[PDB]
Design a binder for these strands. Structure first.
Lengths: 146, 99, 192, 45, 119, 217
RNA sequence: AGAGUGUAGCUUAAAAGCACCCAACUUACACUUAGGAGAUUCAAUUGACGCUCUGA
């Protein structure tokens, strides 16, 4: 009841903040909160690309579990479409004929939100030390449309 | 507009009679289970080493930040804030053979 | 018109700021464990446990029995570690565990249960049936020595009285075969 | 530390064979690439 | 005797005289039999040295099967052979709980308590 | 309040090759390739063996092998670059290409009047300038070459206490892109040194506690 | 050299409960299923092993 000592004992929506907003076409990015004594970066991108698919998938799983274990939030994880590259082989003796062979390229993306600068440098070095064989890392910014 | 490439092609349906055969024995399955047990313990060991290094490095950095805050009232304001040198940060992976 | 609470509000200890840096219940059984943990506490509002006949249980109950025999838990723990290490040495046990085919010697675990922790289980069964409520007006004890009473009807079988069994009066026609361990310095009073 | 993510399985369900070709880059550097049609050296110019 | 009918929106239902309740820790598996007033009657847990020494890997499926067999024996010696098992769907589809219910039924202890008379 | 203004830095170097693989991981890669073979289906080379030899027997009753032997020859003509640029040197501790499996940290020698110290390279910061700026400034002084050491953060790394007049030691780290080392025969004893050799070369407690925040690999 | 001390990572747990790791499902995470390893530093509440802070 409203006058009893147990008023508001069944309150729950002051615990769940999720307003269920349109989280598909919204572009309300969080900005870099920088106080000098309190630097905190926003919604930086992480790119992992390779010609091998399963290595990129495995390292994306690794970095996802790593940032999940260190309590820094994952915004979204998704992938770009693949690119395919031809090695148009010039013939050895008569170099006017151009034979061809096939090769591929994949890409994976994770996003991180909370980064103090000390944890930023320790985070990027600890990813960079455990960087697997064959991929390239690139910490880019947020305005990356497909 | 997103372009998806997790679609398997429509050619992947028909020729589906090449390797359905799996005929194994008991020694191979016990070998594979024992190897998965060994690899589980090994990966737990690696993750423990990784966590201990991360925690020791973090307490080292925090000890440094505390001593800088004690000894100098102005250098922490520039020392904490992240300079824009590392905006397009990247690093290419290792190799197998040297040049 | 309001009235303040008579104590702490239940979901007040968590902080409403920094919600996204809190750990959520990722499952249903985690919340279930927390809620059935919380429902056992003595709350200050009105609850189900107050009204529905719990006999006002908090009051210490008098023990009248034999003391527990002293064991050195360090040696016991190291010997049990030795035993399970010796069992873990065998590899056919690992094959039986992986291959989903490994039973237990039920008679051995029965005698061992009679040997180690069985008295406390028989104590709580005897308190569930209301024996200590009607035999000693609430005063409780532990059945320290094991006991085996078996009834005699036919030629081969038995109908034993374990703790809480069901035996028909035709099977209780004659005096049963009572046996237990005892030393040659002790006198006993049986009572049914 | 570069042994953590090198042990992988092709996690898509329907997939072809792949072979560990040794790909040499623009300075002569090898990468194990899971590529079909079991070639042994791939020179990317 | 009357069962506690009702509650009709929450889980588990309180309509039983006895319940089967299994607790699956990351170390041990423990099965209880409760009365609905709350006092437990019989239990078989792998924390006990009696079941501990006779098996390996107290977490795994055959340990829960052993717990089912030992609990069925212990509760037939207690004269209680009707109880209710009320699991979540993913526990009821698990192989461990399937083989534990099989060990309970093959031990003679039947689930699905009978109806109340003039309910 | 006299605090003698003293910083430091530690040079970070990326490895070039992956470390060699452990034998249980060899068995794991073997069984992973086995499970890969089992779950795989319908490669082009698989038909180019199977139904090509089938149609071969068919029209004989009336490719693959040549190209795979060609690929064996294309393997055997190209000897790969040998990973061991380590045992053929065995001596050149001053070289950038000595060790490539692991990460390395540089350290310079100067025996002072009162002190005698093998130093991880220091910095002497001036009250008008910033800490990391003095780190890269002394890095421009101490190296006498062109190198691109990309820094990792504005935050320092490890702080220590020596007092004789108080003082302190302020550490920094920076990842190397490429080392274009001029005057490789320097007598200022800079040395490219791994973690085990770091623990070897250190005498004091001031350098022993450094190893906790370098990457142990 | 002095001081605080003491169960695996945590616990006003007494050999426990959470943490933790691998496989399967998921782009991935998360849920769930199926597995994995774990501890009272020793000597008779007292004494001499390890760590931490202060020293020089």
């Amino acid at each position: 009841y409203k006058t009893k000592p147990t008023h508001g004992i069944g309150k729950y929506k002051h615990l769940i903040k999720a307003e269920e907003p349109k989280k598909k076409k919204g572009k309300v990015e969080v900005r870099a909160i920088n106080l000098g004594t309190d630097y905190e970066y926003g919604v930086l991108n992480i790119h992992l690309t390779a010609y091998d698919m399963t290595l990129a998938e495995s390292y994306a799983q690794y970095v996802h579990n790593l940032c999940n274990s260190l309590s820094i939030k994952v915004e979204e994880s998704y992938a770009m479409p693949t690119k395919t590259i031809e090695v148009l082989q010039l013939q050895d003796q008569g170099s006017k004929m151009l034979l061809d062979s096939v090769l591929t390229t994949h890409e994976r993306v994770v996003q991180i939100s909370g980064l103090s600068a000390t944890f930023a440098e320790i985070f990027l070095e600890i990813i960079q030390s455990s960087l697997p064989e064959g991929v390239r890392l690139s910490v880019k910014e947020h305005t990356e449309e497909d | 507009i997103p372009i998806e490439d997790f679609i398997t092609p429509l050619k992947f349906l028909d020729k589906a009679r090449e390797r359905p055969q799996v005929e194994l024995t008991f020694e191979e399955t016990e070998r594979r289970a024992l190897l998965l047990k060994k690899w589980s313990l090994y990966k737990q060991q690696e993750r423990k080493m990784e966590r201990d290094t991360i925690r020791a490095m973090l307490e080292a950095q925090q000890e440094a930040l505390e001593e800088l805050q004690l000894e100098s009232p102005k250098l922490h304001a520039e020392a904490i804030k992240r300079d824009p040198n590392l905006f397009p940060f990247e690093k290419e992976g290792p190799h197998y053979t040297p040049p | 018109r309001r009235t303040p609470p008579l104590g702490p509000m239940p979901n007040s200890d968590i902080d409403l700021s920094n919600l996204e840096r809190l750990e959520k219940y990722r499952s249903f059984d985690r919340y279930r464990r927390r809620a059935e943990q919380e429902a056992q506490a003595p709350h200050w509002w009105r609850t189900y446990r107050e009204y529905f006949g719990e006999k006002t249980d908090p009051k210490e109950k008098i023990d009248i029995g034999l003391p527990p025999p002293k064991v050195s838990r360090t040696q016991q723990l190291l010997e049990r570690k030795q035993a399970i290490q010796e069992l873990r040495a065998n590899v056919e046990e690992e094959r039986a565990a992986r291959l989903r085919t490994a039973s237990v010697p039920l008679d051995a675990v029965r005698a061992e249960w009679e040997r180690t922790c069985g008295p406390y289980h028989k104590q709580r069964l005897a308190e569930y049936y209301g024996l200590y409520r009607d035999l000693f007006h609430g005063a409780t004890f532990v059945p320290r020595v094991p006991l085996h009473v078996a009834y005699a009807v036919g030629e081969d079988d038995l109908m034993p009285v374990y703790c809480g069994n069901e035996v028909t009066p035709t099977e209780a026609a004659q005096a049963p075969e009572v046996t237990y361990e005892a030393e040659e310095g002790s006198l006993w009073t049986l009572l049914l | 530390d570069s042994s953590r993510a090198s042990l992988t399985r092709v996690h898509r369900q329907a997939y072809a064979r792949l072979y560990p070709v040794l790909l040499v880059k623009q300075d002569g550097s090898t990468i194990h690439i899971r590529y079909r049609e079991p070639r042994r050296m791939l020179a990317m110019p | 005797a009357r069962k506690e009918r009702g509650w009709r929106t929450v889980f588990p239902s309180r309509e039983f005289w006895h319940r089967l309740r299994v607790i699956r820790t990351q170390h041990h598996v423990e099965a209880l039999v409760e009365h609905q007033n709350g006092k437990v009657v019989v239990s078989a847990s792998t924390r006990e040295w009696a079941i501990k020494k006779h098996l390996y890997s107290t977490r795994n499926v055959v340990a829960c099967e052993s717990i089912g067999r030992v609990l069925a024996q212990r509760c037939l010696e207690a004269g209680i052979n009707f109880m209710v098992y009320q699991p979540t769907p993913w526990e009821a589809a698990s192989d461990s709980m399937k083989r534990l219910q099989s060990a309970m039924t093959e031990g003679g202890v039947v689930l699905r308590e009978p109806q109340r008379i003039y309910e | 309040s006299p605090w003698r203004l003293l910083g430091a830095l530690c040079l970070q170097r990326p490895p070039v090759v992956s470390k060699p693989l452990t034998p249980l991981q060899e068995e794991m890669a073997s069984l992973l390739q086995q499970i890969e073979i089992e779950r795989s289906l319908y490669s082009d080379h698989e038909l180019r063996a199977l139904d090509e030899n089938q149609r071969l027997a068919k029209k004989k009753a009336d490719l693959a092998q040549d190209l795979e032997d060609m690929w064996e020859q294309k393997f055997l003509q190209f000897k790969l670059g040998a990973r061991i640029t380590e045992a053929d040197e065995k001596n050149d501790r001053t070289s950038l290409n000595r060790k490539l499996d692991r990460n390395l940290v540089l350290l310079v020698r100067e025996k002072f009047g009162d002190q005698d110290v093998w130093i991880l390279p220091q910095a002497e910061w001036q009250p008008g300038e910033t800490l990391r700026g003095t780190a890269e400034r002394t890095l421009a002084t101490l190296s006498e070459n062109n190198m691109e050491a990309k820094f990792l953060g504005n935050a320092p790394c490890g702080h220590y206490t020596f007092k004789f007049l108080g003082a302190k030691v302020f550490f920094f780290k920076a990842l190397l892109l490429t080392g274009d080392f001029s005057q490789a025969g320097n007598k200022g004893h800079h040395v490219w040194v791994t973690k085990d050799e770091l623990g070897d070369y250190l005498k004091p407690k001031y350098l022993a506690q450094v190893r906790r925040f370098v990457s142990d690999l």
